Structure 1
Amino acid sequence: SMMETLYLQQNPNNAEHLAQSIADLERGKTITKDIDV
């Protein structure tokens, strides 16, 4: 259950990207688009 979390965290550059990007989502620094799927 932890392997995927650890994969995302194992490289500090990816961990920093995720931390900043989660903060951006939670603080309202975002870009919204319509995507046809």
Structure 2
Amino acid sequence: GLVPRGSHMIIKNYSYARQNLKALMTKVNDDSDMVTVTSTDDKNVVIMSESDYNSMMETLYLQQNPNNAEHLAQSIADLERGKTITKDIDV
């Protein structure tokens, strides 16, 4: 399966996950790992930190329009290359 960069997928079965649910919630939050909980009937789930979920949906939202995706790519490439505008602004 596919996994975000810097993340690792952990596989656990259901009895285990329900016994150790709090420990798994800490694990995915602390180490940005994700847990596939397996079911005898293959009705499995993936558990991720709320932060990683929000990150994935935010990344999706920004990248999903090819024109916005290109605007972000070019702008981050500009910033890394010093191709920038520096302005003092007041709040």
Query: Which TM-score band (shorter chain)?
Result: over 0.9
Stretches of structure 2 that go unaligned for 5 or more consecutive residues are 1-54
TM-score of the pair, normalised by structure 1? 0.93
Question: What is the TM-score of this pair, normalised by structure 2?
Answer: 0.40
Q: Which has the higher strand share?
A: 2
| Aligned residues: CA RMSD | 0.6
- Identity, in percent, stands at 100
Task: Give the superposition deviation at 1:20.
Answer: 0.3
Q: Which has the larger Rg?
A: 2
Q: CA deviation at 1:3?
A: 0.5
Aligned length: 37
- Runs ≥4 residues deviating over 4 A: none
Shift of residue 14, structure 1, vs aligned partner:
0.3
CA deviations over 1:1-37 (Å, ceiling 9, x no partner): 3101100000000000000000000001000000111
